[PDB]
Amino acid sequence: GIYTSDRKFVQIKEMVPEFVVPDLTGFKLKPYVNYRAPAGIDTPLTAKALFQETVAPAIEKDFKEGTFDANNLEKYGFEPTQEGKLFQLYPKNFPR
Amino acid sequence: AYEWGVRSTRKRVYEIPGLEPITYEGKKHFVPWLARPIFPPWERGWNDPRFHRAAPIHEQTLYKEEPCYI
Amino acid sequence: KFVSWKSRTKYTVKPVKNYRMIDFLRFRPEKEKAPEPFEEKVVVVRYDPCRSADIALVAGGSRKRWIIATENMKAGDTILNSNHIGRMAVAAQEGDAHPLGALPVGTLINNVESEPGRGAQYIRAAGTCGVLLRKVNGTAIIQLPSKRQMQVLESCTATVGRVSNVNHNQRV
Amino acid sequence: PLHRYPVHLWQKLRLRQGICARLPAHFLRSLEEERTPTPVHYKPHGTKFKINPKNGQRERVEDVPIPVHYPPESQQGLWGGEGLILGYRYANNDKLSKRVKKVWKPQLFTRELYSEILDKKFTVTVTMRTLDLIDEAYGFDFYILKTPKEDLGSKFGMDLKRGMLLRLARQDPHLHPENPERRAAIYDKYRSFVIPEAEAEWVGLTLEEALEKQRLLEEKDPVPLFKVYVEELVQRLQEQVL
Amino acid sequence: TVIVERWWKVPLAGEGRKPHLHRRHRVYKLVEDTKHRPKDNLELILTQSVDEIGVRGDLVSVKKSVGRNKLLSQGLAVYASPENRKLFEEEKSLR
RNA sequence: AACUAAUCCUAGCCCUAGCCCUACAAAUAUAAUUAUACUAUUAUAUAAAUCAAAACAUUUAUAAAAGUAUUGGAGA
RNA sequence: AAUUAUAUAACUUAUCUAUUUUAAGUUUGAAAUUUC
């Protein structure tokens, strides 16, 4: 909140965080996993991998079809700016 | 001593044509080795009553030349 | 760059948090008057904490302002202020502000200014009086408290009489 | 330990490495080259031979330059090589007399000079020697352009030279506005100093300014990896089509 | 302009050394200084009229600051290049 | 064979050689380490003296020629 | 004291400025030299 003149506190509803709680009913993921469960080989997601998984198929299909142009790069998922999204990747404007 | 003016206050490179002097605007902070940038008026994007200033009486739309003595 | 303690927007005669805003330019033509002889009333002779001499509250016409008090200035007195330089001398009463051309030779004066338009800088202390040593046409000789006898134009304003605490020099 | 290169070579290494190497070759040559200012207060020995003390025989000679101080105000003015001489004097020009601390002041002045190239009259600090040089130079504009930096002894004059050189280089219509015919005459009159625009920009630039300017030239916004992958993906796909 | 010369000879350093200055080597002799002299002559043409030193457009030789402080300062004189020298003197033929 | 005590060998260092160098979060210059406006913002003079001249005053270093000539209260 | 004292500072003359027809003197003294 913000303290106004005379040192009087005025709570700002916007600046007070709202806890968004997921619905855990019916969710099979729990604090622990069985020792029975084998571990998976780590494959961290990266910009190249994300581009390959999501962006590459769209461009590949369009390029073969010939319907690819620089103007439509945003169609494949490019964001010229992060402004306007509740969660902005850069500059980071959201709490975890 | 009577002072004309409030007693409180009392106890080249740019002109050159063809080039523009470099300034610390890129630095985003003052550095002694760079020239002072020219700063245009700042736009907050919203109106703040705390920093809002009431306009002079004459600029008011309700301004009337005749004086009303209240 | 220091925040001024004289932070009052408008000149006032009420004590200011007290300090009273004094005016050392005696003849400021007040509202509804021509730049000619006008009269003011000495409402009260109070003491200024920030000045050695006691200040006389001079109220005339539509404007009220504090000023330094002369030797005999007291509450309820009527004080005249004239800018007109008459061919003949203008009647002089103790403490009145007139051009040195108006003043007659030999009158004790105070709150004099070395240069026309400079404003009062001398004889503002208690018990200090400047003698109008000589007067000719537009020139007059004023003996300032520094012992420097200086010649100034008649445009300079002189207030008749000695400053308050007349016997300050006679203190033993 | 001991440094492989002496301290003086540290400056050389810094110039030879980093953004300094990336600086324009023309500007680097101007910085690297050093030209001695014209002697004004001292003369080199006329004869190349003198008597050696120990052997009492004729020997080769050396020159001792007199110390002359050029204040930064000269860099903000146009001084014709004159400067303040700080040191000691012997009164009456005899060694037998007293030694007096003396500061020798050349007569300094502030004067206005007309520039044809800039079509403006500039009021600047100047000395009498500069005024004679301007007349000898066949014009104030000639003096700024003809005189080298050291002989000119003025950062503002070099800055004026930078503006004049760029004005000549670009054939900018800013010269003598509304008088195109007069503009050509000035360019023709000072045609000798026409140079490439890139060189003219860097004439007289300070080292700190040059480094920042080069940094500004080479600074480029980060590439969105989406675009980079788009270009890479298209190139590979285009190659595959072949 | 001021001209000075070292009083004391400094020992020669040779092909590849610098002589080491000392206190007596730091004393200098004034061979000539314009300050002590009266102003030296300077060549100037006239852009306006001055009393009894000629009239606008003529070429006059006057002591340096005397001409500068009086003539050039008021605008009476200007610096004389050869090109404007002929032009200014030519104007006198027309004057 | 006694109490107090004592015993030990590496912690590391030193000098040359070689080599130059170009390698968490959060908070912070405001009052540093104070999560957001205030208030514009900033180092560096001959190096001196001490010291030597038995004091002190000009002065007093910091490959061969050669510690020679020269310089110096011709003295350190 | 005796002898001085172009540390500076002033004036005068230069200087430097207006118009127009720091140096050298001297003085103060930062001081210096010698003695009582």
Side-chain angles (χ1 to χ4, degrees):
Chain A
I2 299 167
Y3 319 106
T4 68
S5 163
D6 304 334
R7 191 60 57 193
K8 276 152 195 171
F9 174 70
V10 165
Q11 179 143 305
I12 305 297
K13 206 270 184 178
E14 291 73 23
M15 277 199 277
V16 169
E18 176 273 317
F19 295 86
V20 178
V21 185
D23 293 326
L24 322 177
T25 52
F27 199 50
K28 313 154 157 189
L29 315 193
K30 306 167 196 161
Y32 319 98
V33 191
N34 316 138
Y35 281 116
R36 288 181 292 180
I41 301 170
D42 282 4
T43 61
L45 185 63
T46 75
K48 183 68 178 192
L50 181 54
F51 183 98
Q52 287 162 339
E53 295 159 338
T54 64
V55 185
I59 296 174
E60 287 164 331
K61 168 263 290 189
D62 278 324
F63 175 80
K64 297 326 165 179
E65 287 163 10
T67 66
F68 167 81
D69 58 331
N71 304 330
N72 296 335
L73 294 186
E74 297 184 1
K75 170 198 71 178
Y76 305 96
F78 181 67
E79 284 175 3
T81 72
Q82 298 283 317
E83 279 293 357
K85 299 164 54 189
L86 183 47
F87 310 109
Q88 309 176 351
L89 298 150
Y90 174 87
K92 196 188 185 172
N93 76 328
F94 64 92
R96 51 175 298 145
Chain B
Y2 203 116
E3 300 301 338
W4 310 105
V6 296
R7 274 84 65 190
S8 49
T9 56
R10 310 179 177 276
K11 294 178 179 179
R12 297 269 68 77
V13 64
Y14 277 80
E15 302 176 5
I16 294 153
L19 191 68
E20 58 285 14
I22 289 177
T23 70
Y24 51 78
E25 187 170 16
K27 298 306 308 298
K28 291 202 281 160
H29 61 261
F30 164 87
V31 300
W33 58 87
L34 286 184
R36 178 154 163 189
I38 299 168
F39 308 115
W42 160 64
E43 287 83 40
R44 185 190 325 259
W46 64 280
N47 284 340
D48 207 330
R50 298 165 65 246
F51 308 88
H52 165 270
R53 284 154 197 98
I57 292 164
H58 67 271
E59 293 180 7
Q60 302 298 337
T61 60
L62 280 180
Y63 165 73
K64 299 148 174 67
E65 294 79 11
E66 186 190 15
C68 175
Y69 299 92
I70 305 181
Chain C
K1 273 59 65 176
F2 71 99
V3 59
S4 189
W5 67 273
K6 337 193 183 190
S7 68
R8 194 163 184 94
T9 46
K10 68 97 173 180
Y11 186 108
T12 188
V13 294
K14 184 196 65 170
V16 188
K17 184 64 176 65
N18 273 352
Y19 158 72
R20 290 135 207 84
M21 298 174 69
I22 316 308
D23 186 332
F24 281 109
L25 177 68
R26 263 296 281 289
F27 194 104
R28 185 177 325 269
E30 67 95 19
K31 188 203 171 206
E32 313 172 72
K33 291 284 182 66
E36 285 175 349
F38 77 94
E39 284 204 334
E40 311 188 286
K41 184 73 74 69
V42 176
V43 192
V44 298
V45 169
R46 203 161 177 175
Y47 172 83
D48 199 7
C50 299
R51 276 158 212 68
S52 63
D54 51 17
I55 51 176
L57 183 45
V58 57
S62 45
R63 188 190 60 211
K64 275 57 168 178
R65 70 200 173 100
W66 281 102
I67 62 160
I68 284 297
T70 70
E71 161 176 355
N72 301 316
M73 262 194 175
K74 65 169 80 181
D77 301 333
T78 288
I79 202 70
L80 169 76
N81 299 316
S82 161
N83 210 351
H84 173 73
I85 297 167
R87 183 176 56 267
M88 279 178 42
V90 176
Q93 299 306 333
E94 161 156 355
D96 62 1
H98 303 333
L100 285 165
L103 280 298
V105 175
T107 51
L108 311 167
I109 59 167
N110 48 15
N111 292 65
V112 190
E113 60 194 2
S114 67
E115 198 60 21
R118 186 206 178 74
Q121 197 269 350
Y122 310 85
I123 320 169
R124 316 181 306 174
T128 56
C129 79
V131 190
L132 165 51
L133 308 186
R134 285 183 309 279
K135 181 195 179 295
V136 292
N137 297 319
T139 314
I141 313 301
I142 303 313
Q143 163 164 350
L144 306 176
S146 45
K147 304 296 101 175
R148 161 57 58 70
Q149 307 172 346
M150 174 207 305
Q151 69 95 28
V152 309
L153 288 180
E154 62 170 355
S155 161
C156 295
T157 299
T159 68
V160 182
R162 323 190 72 223
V163 184
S164 46
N165 302 316
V166 61
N167 288 343
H168 198 260
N169 54 320
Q170 301 291 321
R171 164 187 53 202
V172 171
Chain D
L2 296 165
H3 309 297
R4 158 59 48 89
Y5 305 87
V7 178
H8 54 74
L9 289 197
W10 295 13
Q11 176 53 31
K12 300 290 288 298
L13 275 162
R14 188 264 280 175
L15 292 189
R16 194 177 307 99
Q17 82 206 18
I19 190 166
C20 294
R22 301 201 288 284
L23 274 164
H26 54 84
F27 175 64
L28 282 174
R29 285 188 291 272
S30 84
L31 281 186
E32 288 299 328
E33 63 84 17
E34 290 91 3
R35 199 167 312 106
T36 195
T38 298
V40 166
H41 310 282
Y42 77 92
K43 279 82 73 176
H45 280 305
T47 64
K48 297 297 184 58
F49 279 107
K50 87 164 72 69
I51 302 300
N52 182 310
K54 187 248 180 173
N55 69 31
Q57 320 288 326
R58 181 207 66 157
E59 56 155 355
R60 192 66 65 199
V61 307
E62 294 178 356
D63 294 318
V64 187
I66 298 287
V68 183
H69 161 71
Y70 298 112
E73 165 183 351
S74 83
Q75 313 293 322
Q76 301 309 316
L78 274 299
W79 301 15
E82 289 186 44
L84 290 169
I85 303 177
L86 276 62
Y88 293 85
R89 68 173 300 260
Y90 283 160
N92 309 332
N93 303 307
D94 57 315
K95 167 197 152 298
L96 275 61
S97 279
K98 298 182 178 58
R99 187 177 76 136
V100 187
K101 287 255 285 181
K102 177 70 169 287
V103 174
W104 281 293
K105 304 180 70 63
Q107 294 179 356
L108 287 164
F109 303 97
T110 180
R111 278 87 180 89
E112 196 152 324
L113 299 158
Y114 173 77
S115 159
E116 310 178 0
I117 296 176
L118 311 171
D119 187 22
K120 188 205 149 178
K121 293 178 76 67
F122 300 77
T123 185
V124 180
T125 303
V126 70
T127 50
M128 292 295 105
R129 175 163 153 84
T130 306
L131 308 172
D132 293 357
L133 289 156
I134 287 160
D135 294 348
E136 296 148 18
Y138 295 91
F140 163 75
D141 292 332
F142 284 113
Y143 165 73
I144 298 297
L145 287 164
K146 282 167 173 181
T147 313
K149 172 167 191 310
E150 294 89 3
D151 297 352
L152 189 59
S154 166
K155 164 61 168 175
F156 175 48
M158 274 306 295
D159 293 350
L160 279 167
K161 182 181 216 162
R162 174 174 77 246
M164 287 185 191
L165 288 169
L166 271 173
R167 184 71 69 76
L168 300 169
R170 302 159 171 164
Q171 304 288 315
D172 190 352
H174 271 105
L175 200 151
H176 278 165
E178 303 294 332
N179 293 53
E181 58 89 7
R182 204 178 179 200
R183 171 167 73 246
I186 302 307
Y187 285 138
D188 181 73
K189 182 173 199 196
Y190 305 99
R191 68 186 180 279
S192 64
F193 291 97
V194 176
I195 56 172
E197 195 177 343
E199 310 197 352
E201 269 148 354
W202 292 80
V203 173
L205 290 193
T206 66
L207 197 149
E208 65 279 25
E209 284 171 352
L211 291 175
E212 181 63 6
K213 187 181 182 312
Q214 179 70 24
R215 200 197 54 74
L216 292 170
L217 289 172
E218 71 196 33
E219 70 185 359
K220 196 264 183 182
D221 48 3
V223 289
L225 277 189
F226 184 105
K227 291 180 163 155
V228 176
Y229 299 147
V230 175
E231 302 318 319
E232 181 278 329
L233 185 70
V234 170
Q235 292 163 15
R236 192 191 52 77
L237 292 178
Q238 166 269 345
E239 290 160 354
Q240 186 63 56
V241 162
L242 301 176
Chain E
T1 187
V2 56
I3 315 169
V4 297
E5 182 201 338
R6 290 199 135 88
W7 272 106
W8 289 80
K9 174 267 295 176
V10 192
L12 297 174
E15 293 297 346
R17 299 160 63 253
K18 303 296 187 293
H20 172 228
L21 286 173
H22 299 106
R23 307 290 64 76
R24 74 280 190 190
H25 302 158
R26 187 179 292 275
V27 305
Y28 315 121
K29 95 183 72 174
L30 177 74
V31 301
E32 202 288 300
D33 191 16
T34 317
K35 289 208 301 301
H36 306 118
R37 291 184 170 187
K39 270 73 75 168
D40 281 331
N41 282 42
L42 177 59
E43 291 266 337
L44 302 167
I45 50 178
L46 286 196
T47 42
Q48 285 169 45
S49 52
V50 69
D51 278 327
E52 296 300 319
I53 305 168
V55 56
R56 194 269 179 182
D58 65 355
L59 180 84
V60 303
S61 280
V62 183
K63 312 177 70 63
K64 274 164 166 311
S65 89
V66 171
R68 180 67 207 64
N69 80 331
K70 296 148 191 183
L71 315 174
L72 282 150
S73 81
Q74 287 166 116
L76 319 187
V78 74
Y79 321 114
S81 70
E83 280 79 25
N84 78 332
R85 262 189 186 199
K86 52 185 286 185
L87 289 169
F88 269 76
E89 72 185 2
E90 175 177 11
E91 285 292 329
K92 270 306 192 217
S93 78
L94 305 173
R95 192 269 301 169

